[PDB]
């Protein structure tokens with residue numbers, strides 16, 4: 001399609017399904033998530049978003065990323081810090097896992113931000129528009145599965161408080177994505193990088209399910 005936002009959506013349909021089909025996500029969707037499994041995905045997300053948000057800050061004034069720079073609206077590191085303090089306690093930094101599959105994803109995010117920053121939009125699309133677009137169904141599942149106390153914390157990640165309307169915001173973000181100027185080669189690489197981002201998530205899911213089933 002002409003618009004990058006539509007090109008991305010169409011090009012990643014089949015890997016999104018692969019993610020939906022991954023065993024860990026099948027189980028999450030059938031509501032068979034455990035607190036230990038949930039904790040692991042929240043730890044994963046912290047590492048991913050620390051790396052992604054570091055590289056967005058690095059490249060925020062670059063013409064290859066500035067049009068989609070929305071820090072107040074989208075930043076997730078602080079929310080995940082709040083959440084991990086709940087799930088892993090006050091010493092969470094010293095005890096959260098940082099696994100090889102998590103490292104693989106973080107490594108690629110830094111390579112992209114430092115040496116192929118034109119591709120960073122692919123990673124911000126995959127994470128932010130996915131977490132925003134899917135956050136509604138994704139949260140629903142946990143709360144009814146995790147039996148959390150009524151302690152007012154642990155799921156801040158699933159609320160973007162500086163977005164009053166997700167629908168308006170997605171429209172805006174897509175608009176901005178579409179205003180990026182790129183050659184056909186870069187556009188091709190951006191699309192492939194969005195597929196790569198999905199596969200990095202899928203391989204993570206495969207690792208976490210392994211870790212949880214000993």
Ligand code: HEM
Pocket residue numbers: 005008009016019020021025026029125126127129130131133134137197198201
């Ligand atoms: C069990 C797994 C998953 C479920 C149930 C699912 C849920 C959703 C929902 C409900 C939407 C709405 C579609 C729309 O935009 O109209 C969607 C969008 C999307 N999700 Fe997921 N998702 C899952 C896995 C993931 C993963 C692992 C990623 C990436 C890390 C992801 C990235 C995306 C993206 C980028 C979109 C937005 C598409 C676009 O508008 O271009 N999803 N997903």
